[PDB]
Write a protein that holds these residues in place. Structure first.
Motif, PDB file in Angstrom:
ATOM      1  N   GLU B 203       0.826  -1.200   0.000  1.00 31.95           N
ATOM      2  CA  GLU B 203       0.000   0.000   0.000  1.00 31.95           C
ATOM      3  C   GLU B 203       0.862   1.251   0.000  1.00 31.95           C
ATOM      4  O   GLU B 203       1.087   1.837   1.049  1.00 31.95           O
ATOM      5  CB  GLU B 203      -0.927   0.009   1.214  1.00 31.95           C
ATOM      6  CG  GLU B 203      -1.781  -1.231   1.348  1.00 31.95           C
ATOM      7  CD  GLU B 203      -2.761  -1.389   0.203  1.00 31.95           C
ATOM      8  OE1 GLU B 203      -3.150  -0.366  -0.397  1.00 31.95           O
ATOM      9  OE2 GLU B 203      -3.142  -2.540  -0.098  1.00 31.95           O
ATOM     10  N   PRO B 204       1.331   1.663  -1.174  1.00 31.95           N
ATOM     11  CA  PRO B 204       2.255   2.806  -1.255  1.00 31.95           C
ATOM     12  C   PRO B 204       1.686   4.066  -0.622  1.00 31.95           C
ATOM     13  O   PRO B 204       2.434   4.811   0.029  1.00 31.95           O
ATOM     14  CB  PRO B 204       2.474   2.974  -2.766  1.00 31.95           C
ATOM     15  CG  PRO B 204       2.276   1.605  -3.310  1.00 31.95           C
ATOM     16  CD  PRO B 204       1.192   0.976  -2.470  1.00 31.95           C
ATOM     17  N   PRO B 205       0.396   4.367  -0.774  1.00 31.20           N
ATOM     18  CA  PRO B 205      -0.161   5.481  -0.004  1.00 31.20           C
ATOM     19  C   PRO B 205      -0.431   5.089   1.436  1.00 31.20           C
ATOM     20  O   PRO B 205      -0.625   3.917   1.763  1.00 31.20           O
ATOM     21  CB  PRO B 205      -1.462   5.815  -0.741  1.00 31.20           C
ATOM     22  CG  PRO B 205      -1.309   5.209  -2.075  1.00 31.20           C
ATOM     23  CD  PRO B 205      -0.547   3.961  -1.829  1.00 31.20           C
ATOM     24  N   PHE B 206      -0.424   6.095   2.303  1.00 35.73           N
ATOM     25  CA  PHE B 206      -0.847   5.965   3.688  1.00 35.73           C
ATOM     26  C   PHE B 206      -1.485   7.274   4.112  1.00 35.73           C
ATOM     27  O   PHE B 206      -0.924   8.344   3.876  1.00 35.73           O
ATOM     28  CB  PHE B 206       0.316   5.661   4.622  1.00 35.73           C
ATOM     29  CG  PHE B 206       1.042   4.406   4.293  1.00 35.73           C
ATOM     30  CD1 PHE B 206       0.689   3.216   4.892  1.00 35.73           C
ATOM     31  CD2 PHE B 206       2.095   4.418   3.403  1.00 35.73           C
ATOM     32  CE1 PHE B 206       1.367   2.055   4.602  1.00 35.73           C
ATOM     33  CE2 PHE B 206       2.777   3.263   3.111  1.00 35.73           C
ATOM     34  CZ  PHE B 206       2.414   2.078   3.712  1.00 35.73           C
ATOM     35  N   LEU B 207      -2.642   7.192   4.748  1.00 36.16           N
ATOM     36  CA  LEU B 207      -3.369   8.370   5.191  1.00 36.16           C
ATOM     37  C   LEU B 207      -3.279   8.448   6.705  1.00 36.16           C
ATOM     38  O   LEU B 207      -3.997   7.732   7.410  1.00 36.16           O
ATOM     39  CB  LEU B 207      -4.823   8.312   4.730  1.00 36.16           C
ATOM     40  CG  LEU B 207      -5.711   9.497   5.091  1.00 36.16           C
ATOM     41  CD1 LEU B 207      -5.094  10.792   4.596  1.00 36.16           C
ATOM     42  CD2 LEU B 207      -7.099   9.306   4.505  1.00 36.16           C
ATOM     43  N   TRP B 208      -2.407   9.315   7.203  1.00 30.07           N
ATOM     44  CA  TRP B 208      -2.115   9.393   8.628  1.00 30.07           C
ATOM     45  C   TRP B 208      -2.366  10.811   9.099  1.00 30.07           C
ATOM     46  O   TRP B 208      -1.649  11.734   8.701  1.00 30.07           O
ATOM     47  CB  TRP B 208      -0.678   8.984   8.925  1.00 30.07           C
ATOM     48  CG  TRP B 208      -0.298   9.214  10.350  1.00 30.07           C
ATOM     49  CD1 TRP B 208      -0.777   8.554  11.440  1.00 30.07           C
ATOM     50  CD2 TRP B 208       0.646  10.161  10.841  1.00 30.07           C
ATOM     51  NE1 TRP B 208      -0.196   9.037  12.582  1.00 30.07           N
ATOM     52  CE2 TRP B 208       0.684  10.026  12.239  1.00 30.07           C
ATOM     53  CE3 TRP B 208       1.460  11.116  10.236  1.00 30.07           C
ATOM     54  CZ2 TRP B 208       1.504  10.809  13.041  1.00 30.07           C
ATOM     55  CZ3 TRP B 208       2.271  11.895  11.034  1.00 30.07           C
ATOM     56  CH2 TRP B 208       2.291  11.736  12.421  1.00 30.07           C
ATOM     57  N   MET B 209      -3.376  10.980   9.948  1.00 30.74           N
ATOM     58  CA  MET B 209      -3.724  12.279  10.508  1.00 30.74           C
ATOM     59  C   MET B 209      -3.998  13.294   9.406  1.00 30.74           C
ATOM     60  O   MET B 209      -3.735  14.486   9.555  1.00 30.74           O
ATOM     61  CB  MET B 209      -2.631  12.787  11.446  1.00 30.74           C
ATOM     62  CG  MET B 209      -3.154  13.267  12.778  1.00 30.74           C
ATOM     63  SD  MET B 209      -2.124  14.556  13.487  1.00 30.74           S
ATOM     64  CE  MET B 209      -2.317  15.830  12.247  1.00 30.74           C
ATOM     65  N   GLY B 210      -4.522  12.817   8.285  1.00 32.05           N
ATOM     66  CA  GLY B 210      -4.781  13.678   7.160  1.00 32.05           C
ATOM     67  C   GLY B 210      -3.578  13.983   6.306  1.00 32.05           C
ATOM     68  O   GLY B 210      -3.717  14.700   5.308  1.00 32.05           O
TER      69      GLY B 210
END
Lengths: 398, 532
Positions: B203-210
């Motif tokens: 999962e190359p993207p990661f959504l962390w705290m926006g």
């Protein structure tokens, strides 16, 4: 233990902590965790809304940090608990000693625990970079260092230990403040330093743990130029300076001097000569009609002279100053100069009237709040207010 | 099995109590359906009728289907205070294996005070009671964070290498271990998390705290709002929070009026009117908010290097980096007083702000690359009255630069036509006039409107400066005019002050001195009779 109280209708201090440097926090974590390992402090949750700021410093050349807690709000709030115990009389002989040595005795408080119901008020947070971890909040279980009552609890306990010392060498005056012991002896420095060692051994024997020269301390007067051939500009500047001086020395009359080109010299008139000389003599004499009213706090005003020099005025009311002096150190850093100057003012103030005055600093508050802790080596912390008006006093004094 | 953090009310309060405006049966069925399953989960318990309090419950679709919500607006007014920055993307070190875990509504796993449960009843117009953290209590985030810390401490202790963050529901776990190894270690993490009753969903993207974490770069997922002619009030109470959060990411967000319009209002039955002016401010703010940020991960082995550039008339830049052409963070600074200032002082203030922000974010102060020439900085710091410091820095040459435009001489000048000025003002009819008195006696008194004492003292200098050559001497009886002028300012709200600045730029040798007032000094006596 003994009870600890607050001024009625006064809540515990809630003052947020300013950011700290990475090495400072890295060392502070070590110090605080070691403290908790020895039972000195216990961690708390979110039910305690109070907080007082913290900053780890280095007092001397020894490579070991030590933390300070700005209890300015806690001392102000718990000012009532001082009135129950006054140290009477304050030693007036320290003002006359030939050598006063400051011995830190902060470690004494680590053995006398606090009254439980007040433990909650001493809380602090050692913040983490980038606000990654929320910030470890502790409470003080043993007595604090900078808390006003910290020596108040230990006063009777300590004076017991000092009884042999005051018994056997009365000429020593030993006086204490929030963390420090001032020992004075109007002897030759050779044996003054000798009894310093014995006092250290006496203190450590019962489990406790530049030079400061009040005699050499002097009051700097104000002088007036006397150029061989002054010009019209010089008289204008001199009058502008002098008319301010009447607010200090009332016996000043210039009506002759203002009797009146400014490319040339104007030789002074004889009656102006005599009156001006009389005024010069009056100015160069000890200040008059001034004393101490212990009912009001003390104000310390620092003004910069801009060439590696500083001047300060220590007054309790305007236009009537107790102590006046200059601070000089010859291209270097600038904030360091005020911090050293503030520290020297407060050391003299502790010796002479036994309390830290309120400062009127010549610096933007934003500037001070960032680099004041970089260069402060002292357990105490003075109250300061910030000045944003350049007066004529800076040109007036030096 | 998890220790309950003790919680108490604010003193001298015995609430809360608000009659729930009775609902209707179609939604009441939804409330019952939620309640039964919530209870059998051991979450909410049917208290005894002796508890006298109540709070409202509404039903929300959770999309723009009857999700439960309890309004704790009056409850929050009595809770004891608790300790409440934000982690910037710029302060994430490189970690070759990264995952972000979300806790499965972990607020429903950390018990609330059983002794405080009396204050959070729940009626369906059948009184109920929360036993875990409320899903909307402003007190919940603090105790949730505390519990998460206490439960994570052992796992972190037994693994020093890994780095674990947690803000609201995300657990940013990172490590340099291989993915094959890191998944196994993260499986250990999940099992330990379940041990204490916490539930982890699934999962190359990661959504962390926006923030969107990427293999070598970081960005902000574009933040946008729902749009409607009138918005649901409670959602507005949410959108204010979203804008507040975006304020840290992107500056230039103010919702103070929108907050006031909400705070005064306390009802939902009436369709809440919204102002056009604040709404347009929101829209224009959003239009600016359409800007993709960027950045790269901080490597502590390489020093920060900042740089400020002077755009114009009180606009600056805050470029921060550790390698060329890879911005760590970019910002802008503008004047704060807006009344009197100078460019060098603005540069010093900008350095102060940058240093504060840098200590906040990374902790180590940077090496600024200022534009000003070193001679100018040394002169201003050695002559200005106050105390200023700048940490280690070097000049960088750009076509725009900062300099002190003019200097006030320190010695009265031979031959220069020394010009005396004076000023005064009245109150009943603003009947005060201005002028100047000169070595040869030239003068002009020109009547002035809106005559103000400080204004008159200023006007006296300008009147003479207009009709003065290159080398001038001005003697003024104002400490205030002298103070304003000699601060070497460059921008002021006064076109009178600005006119003086533009005038004095032309002059070559200008020297100012001061005199006591209401005294005869052989000068202004020619028009001493000006006002009295």
């Amino acid at each position: 233990t003994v009870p600890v109280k607050l001024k009625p209708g006064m809540d515990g201090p809630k003052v947020k902590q300013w950011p700290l440097t990475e090495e400072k926090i890295k060392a502070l974590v070590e110090i605080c965790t070691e403290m908790e390992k020895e039972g000195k402090i216990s961690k708390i949750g979110p039910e305690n809304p109070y907080n007082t700021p913290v900053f780890a410093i280095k007092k001397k050349d020894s490579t070991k940090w030590r933390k300070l807690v700005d209890f300015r709000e806690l001392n102000k709030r718990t000012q009532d608990f001082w009135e129950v115990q006054l140290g009477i009389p304050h030693p007036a002989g320290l003002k006359k000693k030939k050598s006063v040595t400051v011995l830190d005795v902060g470690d004494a408080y680590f053995s006398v625990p606090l009254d439980e119901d007040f433990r909650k008020y001493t809380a602090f947070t050692i913040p983490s970079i980038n606000n990654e971890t929320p910030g470890i909040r502790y409470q003080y279980n043993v007595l604090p260092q900078g808390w006003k009552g910290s020596p108040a609890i230990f006063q009777s306990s300590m004076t017991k230990i000092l009884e042999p010392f005051k018994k056997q060498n009365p000429d020593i005056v030993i006086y204490q403040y929030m963390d420090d012991l001032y020992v004075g002896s109007d002897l030759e420095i050779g044996q003054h330093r000798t009894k310093i060692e014995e006092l250290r051994q006496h203190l450590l024997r019962w489990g406790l743990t530049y030079e400061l020269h009040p005699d050499k301390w002097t009051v700097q007067p104000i002088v007036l130029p006397e150029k061989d051939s002054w010009t019209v500009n010089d008289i204008q500047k001199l009058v502008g300076k002098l008319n301010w001086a009447s607010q200090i020395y009332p016996g000043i009359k210039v009506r002759q001097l203002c009797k009146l080109a400014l490319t040339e010299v104007i030789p002074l008139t004889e009656e102006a000569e005599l009156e001006l000389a009389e005024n010069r003599e009056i100015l160069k004499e000890p200040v008059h009609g001034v004393y101490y009213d212990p009912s009001k706090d003390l104000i310390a005003e620092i003004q910069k002279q801009g060439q590696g020099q500083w001047t300060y005025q220590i007054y309790q009311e305007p236009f009537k100053n107790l102590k006046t002096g200059k601070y000089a150190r010859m291209h270097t850093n600038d904030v360091k100069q005020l911090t050293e100057a503030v520290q020297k003012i407060t050391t003299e103030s502790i010796v002479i009237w036994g309390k830290t005055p309120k400062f009127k600093l010549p610096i933007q508050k934003e500037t001070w709040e960032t680099w004041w802790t970089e260069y402060w080596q002292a357990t105490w912390i003075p109250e300061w207010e910030f000045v944003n008006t350049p007066p004529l006093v800076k040109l007036w004094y030096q």
